[PDB]
Design a protein around this ligand. Structure first.
Ligand SMILES: NC(=S)Nc1ccccc1OC(F)(F)F
Ligand SMILES: [Cl-]
Length: 115
């Protein structure tokens, strides 16, 4: 069901290596709906190439636009299992400290801050 489940550590590593080769300026991001989530829809896909200059605040806006949410629907985004300490950090910086050992940056979203 979840991404890590569907692809071997070997396969995830090689896809990150291909994104480096073909999209050197993009951060490889996995974005998944919390398996408990009731309100928010599921995304059209799982794997995103994010321009390395966008900050977490702009990534949240991007995903809210992708889900086509409205002003008073809630949205929380966990990175590498935990709350973001700041939304102003460039995703290049966030990647370097929060990346998985496979090379992806893992994110999960929910309507509840209590995931
Ligand atoms: N659409 C995605 S997933 N990423 C993206 C972002 C900005 C420009 C182009 C993009 O696609 C590309 F990475 F495939 F090039
Ligand atoms: Cl590129």
């Amino acid at each position: 069901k979840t991404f890590k489940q569907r692809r071997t550590f070997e396969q995830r590593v090689e896809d990150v290596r291909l994104i480096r080769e073909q999209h050197p300026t993009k951060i490889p991001v996995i974005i998944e709906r919390y398996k408990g989530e009731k309100q928010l829809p599921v995304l059209d896909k799982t794997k995103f190439l994010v321009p390395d200059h966008v900050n977490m605040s702009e990534l949240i806006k991007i995903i809210r636009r992708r889900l086509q949410l409205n002003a008073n629907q809630a949205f929380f985004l966990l990175v590498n299992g935990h709350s973001m300490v700041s939304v102003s950090t460039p995703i290049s910086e966030v990647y370097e400290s929060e990346k998985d050992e496979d090379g992806f940056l893992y994110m999960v979203y929910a309507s509840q801050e209590t995931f």
